Amino acid sequence: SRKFFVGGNWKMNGRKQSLGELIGTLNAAKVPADTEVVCAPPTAYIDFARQKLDPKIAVAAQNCYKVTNGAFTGEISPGMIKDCGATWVVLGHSERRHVFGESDELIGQKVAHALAEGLGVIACIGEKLDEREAGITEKVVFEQTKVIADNVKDWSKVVLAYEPVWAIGTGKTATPQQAQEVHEKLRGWLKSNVSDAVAQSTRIIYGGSVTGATCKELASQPDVDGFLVGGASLKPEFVDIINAKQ
Amino acid sequence: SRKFFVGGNWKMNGRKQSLGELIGTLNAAKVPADTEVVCAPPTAYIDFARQKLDPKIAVAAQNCYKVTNGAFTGEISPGMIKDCGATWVVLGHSERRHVFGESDELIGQKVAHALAEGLGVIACIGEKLDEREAGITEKVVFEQTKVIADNVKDWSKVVLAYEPVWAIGTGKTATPQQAQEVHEKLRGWLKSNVSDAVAQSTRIIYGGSVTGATCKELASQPDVDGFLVGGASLKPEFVDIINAKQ
Numbered sequence: 001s002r003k004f005f006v007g008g009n010w011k012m013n014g015r016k017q018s019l020g021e022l023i024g025t026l027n028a029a030k031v032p033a034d035t036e037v038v039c040a041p042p043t044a045y046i047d048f049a050r051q052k053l054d055p056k057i058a059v060a061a062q063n064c065y066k067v068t069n070g071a072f073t074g075e076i077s078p079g080m081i082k083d084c085g086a087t088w089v090v091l092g093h094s095e096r097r098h099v100f101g102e103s104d105e106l107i108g109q110k111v112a113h114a115l116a117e118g119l120g121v122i123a124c125i126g127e128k129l130d131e132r133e134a135g136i137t138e139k140v141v142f143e144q145t146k147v148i149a150d151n152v153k154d155w156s157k158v159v160l161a162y163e164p165v166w167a168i169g170t171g172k173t174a175t176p177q178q179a180q181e182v183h184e185k186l187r188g189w190l191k192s193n194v195s196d197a198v199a200q201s202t203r204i205i206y207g208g209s210v211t212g213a214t215c216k217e218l219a220s221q222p223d224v225d226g227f228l229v230g231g232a233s234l235k236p237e238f239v240d241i242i243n244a245k246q
Numbered sequence: 247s248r249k250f251f252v253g254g255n256w257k258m259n260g261r262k263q264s265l266g267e268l269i270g271t272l273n274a275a276k277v278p279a280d281t282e283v284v285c286a287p288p289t290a291y292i293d294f295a296r297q298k299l300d301p302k303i304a305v306a307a308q309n310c311y312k313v314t315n316g317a318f319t320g321e322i323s324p325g326m327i328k329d330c331g332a333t334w335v336v337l338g339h340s341e342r343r344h345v346f347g348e349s350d351e352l353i354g355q356k357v358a359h360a361l362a363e364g365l366g367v368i369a370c371i372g373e374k375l376d377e378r379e380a381g382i383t384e385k386v387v388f389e390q391t392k393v394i395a396d397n398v399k400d401w402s403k404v405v406l407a408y409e410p411v412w413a414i415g416t417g418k419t420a421t422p423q424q425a426q427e428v429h430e431k432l433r434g435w436l437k438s439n440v441s442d443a444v445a446q447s448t449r450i451i452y453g454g455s456v457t458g459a460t461c462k463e464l465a466s467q468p469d470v471d472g473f474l475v476g477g478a479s480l481k482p483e484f485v486d487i488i489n490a491k492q
C-alpha cells in the first residue's frame with residue numbers, strides 16, 4: 001500500500017526562536033508506522049531546520065530554480081538545497097503559479113532539474129475558480145500533470161499534491177467528496193498515460209483546507225494519500241494531522 | 247563626500263565550501279578608508295555567510311517580500327533577514343523585474359516594508375533595450391526612482407543602483423560616459439524631486455559590466471559612487487574593485 005505522506009509547508013512564517021520551538025514539538029511526536037513526514041521551512045532557514053529536526057523528518061525547500069548556478073538574483077538551486085541537507089523540494093505550489101506567475105513550462109523544467117540532481121519533488125497542481133466554473137477542472141489538472149510527468153524519469157521520487165485553488169480565498173468550500181473526485185481522476189490519468197503500476201504507487205496528497213477536526217475524514221477518502229498542510233503546520237495540531245489514519 | 251560603496255551580488259552561485267573560500271579571501275582584504283562593502287549571498291546561505299564574514303563587511307539578502315509573515319511559499323521577509331544577521335536587502339534587481347516579472351508597484355511596497363523593518367535597501371533601476379532605443383531612458387528610470395522615493399522615509403538607509411539592462415545580454419556595450427550620463431540625470435531627479443541635500447548624499451552605484459581592468463575609469467566618473475558587482479564578485483578580482491578609487 002501507499003505510505004501515508006504528510007508535508008508541513010511553513011510558507012513565509014517563523015523565526016529561529018519559534019521555529020526551534022515548533023521543531024521541538026515535532027521531534028517529540030511519535031510518527032506512526034508507514035507514515036512519511038516532510039517539513040518545508042522558509043528558504044533562509046533550510047539549513048537551520050535540518051540541523052534541529054531529527055532525521056526521522058525530512059526537509060524540503062519551498063521552491064528552486066531550473067539550473068545549478070547562474071545569474072538569477074533571489075533564486076536557489078537543487079545543489080544548494082542538497083548542500084543544506086534537505087532532500088525534497090516543493091514545485092508548482094499555487095502561490096508560485098498564481099501570485100508569482102510561474103508557468104507550466106518553467107515548472108516542468110524545474111522538476112526535471114531537481115529530480116536529476118537527486119531531490120524528491122512534491123509537485124503541486126490545481127485549478128482556479130474560473131477554470132472550475134467553466135467545467136475544465138480535468139483539462140487543467142491533466143495538462144499540469146502531463147507537464148510534470150514529461151519531466152519524471154523515476155516516479156519513486158515524486159509525490160503529487162492537489163490544491164483546490166478554486167476553494168482557497170474565493171468563498172467556496174471543497175467537500176471531501178469533491179477532493180476525492182479530483183484525486184480519482186488524477187490517478188486515472190496516471191493509469192492511462194504513464195502506467196497502472198505508477199498509478200497504484202504514487203501518493204496523491206490533498207493541499208486544501210485541513211485541520212485536526214477534518215483530517216480523519218479526508219484521509220479516509222480512497223485516493224487521498226496524505227496532505228500538504230499550510231497554516232496548521234505551524235501549530236501542535238500538525239501532529240494530529242500526522243495521525244489522521246490512526 | 248559620499249562614501250564609496252561596493253556591493254557583491256553572488257546571485258545564484260556558491261556552495262558552503264566555495265563560499266567559505268571566497269569569504270576567507272574577502273576577510274583578508276584590507277578595506278580602504280571611507281569604503282563600504284556589502285555582499286549578497288544566495289538566500290539559503292544568508293546566515294552561513296554572516297557567521298563567516300567579518301563584521302567589517304555587511305550582508306544583504308538578494309530579495310524579500312512585502313509583509314512580515316504570510317502565505318507566500320518560497321518568499322522571505324525582512325524580519326527573517328534581520329534574524330539571520332543581515333542588514334541590507336537588494337530590491338528591484340533587473341533579474342527580478344525582467345526574468346521574474348516583479349512590477350514597480352510591488353517593488354515600492356517591498357522598499358517600504360524593508361525600510362520600516364530597519365534594513366538598508368540597495369534599490370535597483372534601469373531601462374531595457376527597447377526603452378533605450380525609443381529614447382525613453384529618462385522617463386523609465388525617473389518613474390522607477392519615483393516609486394522608490396515615494397516609499398523612503400529615511401534616505402540614509404538607501405543606495406540606488408543603475409543597471410544598464412539595455413547593455414546586458416543584448417550585444418550593446420555601455421561606455422563609461424553613457425553610465426555617467428544616466429547617473430547625472432538620476433542625481434538631478436533627486437535634486438528636483440526630493441531635495442538638494444538628498445541628491446548630494448545618496449550613493450548612486452553602477453550595476454553594469456565592471457572588471458578589475460575597467461573599475462578605475464568607471465569609479466572616476468563624477469556621479470558613479472561605487473558598484474553592484476555581478477560575476478566578478480565571486481572571484482579574487484572583487485578585491486581590486488573594492489579598491490577602484492585607490
Ligand SMILES: O=P(O)(O)OC[C@H](O)CO
Nearest residue numbers: 094095098128165168169
Ligand atoms: O494563490 P491562491 O492559492 O491564494 O489562489 C490564487 C488564485 O488563482 C487567485 O487568482
Ligand SMILES: O=P(O)(O)OC[C@H](O)CO
Nearest residue numbers: 340341344374411414415
Ligand atoms: O534581466 P537581464 O538583466 O538579463 O535583461 C533582461 C532584459 O529585459 C531582457 O528582457
Ligand SMILES: [Br-]
Nearest residue numbers: 014015315325
Ligand atoms: Br514572527
Ligand SMILES: [Br-]
Nearest residue numbers: 069079260261
Ligand atoms: Br558549484
